[PDB]
Amino acid sequence: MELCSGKPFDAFTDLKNGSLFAFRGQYSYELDEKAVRPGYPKLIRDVWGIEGPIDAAFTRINSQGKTYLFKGSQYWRFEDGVLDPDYPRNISDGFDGIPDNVDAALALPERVYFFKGKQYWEYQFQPQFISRDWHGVPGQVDAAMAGRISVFFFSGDKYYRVNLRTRRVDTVDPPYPRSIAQYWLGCPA
Numbered sequence: 001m002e003l004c005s006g007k008p009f010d011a012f013t014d015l016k017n018g019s020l021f022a023f024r025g026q027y028s029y030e031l032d033e034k035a036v037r038p039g040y041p042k043l044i045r046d047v048w049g050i051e052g053p054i055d056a057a058f059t060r061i062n063s064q065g066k067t068y069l070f071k072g073s074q075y076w077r078f079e080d081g082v083l084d085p086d087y088p089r090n091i092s093d094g095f096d097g098i099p100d101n102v103d104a105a106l107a108l109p110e111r112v113y114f115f116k117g118k119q120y121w122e123y124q125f126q127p128q129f130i131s132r133d134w135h136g137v138p139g140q141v142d143a144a145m146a147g148r149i150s151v152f153f154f155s156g157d158k159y160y161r162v163n164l165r166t167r168r169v170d171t172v173d174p175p176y177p178r179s180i181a182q183y184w185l186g187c188p189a
């Protein structure tokens with residue numbers, strides 16, 4: 001499927017060195033401005049060596065910058081696209097207190113956040129309600145990712161931008177929630 005199909009996404013990694021990956025179904029899309037074919041649809045099994053769909057993803061901010069993919073009760077950790085030895089592992093073993101089958105995850109510009117249903121967990125290398133602490137985020141999310149100064153939450157075919165200083169959905173025009181394809185990816189009309 002094409003990146004700009006307008007369909008919802010399943011997971012996003014965090015912006016790292018100007019690039020990130022989006023996931024939808026069996027497909028992995030590398031989002032890099034330097035790409036000659038930006039967002040060329042590749043198979044998750046071909047790029048990451050695992051079957052889609054995936055549940056959530058994040059990338060850590062440290063210099064190793066390892067990427068974590070979550071599916072069901074398991075997670076995989078990669079470095080430079082290569083699966084580390086002794087993965088996959090159980091979420092319950094790597095992330096004590098985090099549930100299986102998460103909806104989304106993100107790593108802050110060291111804190112990671114997991115989202116499932118109306119709740120989210122803070123993990124540092126006690127659930128709370130998403131709408132209580134992320135002002136303007138409706139509750140249930142389908143995917144999330146962090147940039148440098150903002151985080152983004154995805155719901156169906158639309159998304160929200162949250163300012164990290166205020167923890168509030170920013171006021172833009174047209175307002176959030178708005179089309180992922182049109183306003184986040186800049187897809188052609």
Ligand SMILES: [Cl-]
Nearest residue numbers: 012057105144
């Ligand atoms: Cl995600």
Ligand code: NA
Nearest residue numbers: 012057105144
């Ligand atoms: Na994510």
Ligand code: NA
Nearest residue numbers: 010055103142
């Ligand atoms: Na998801």
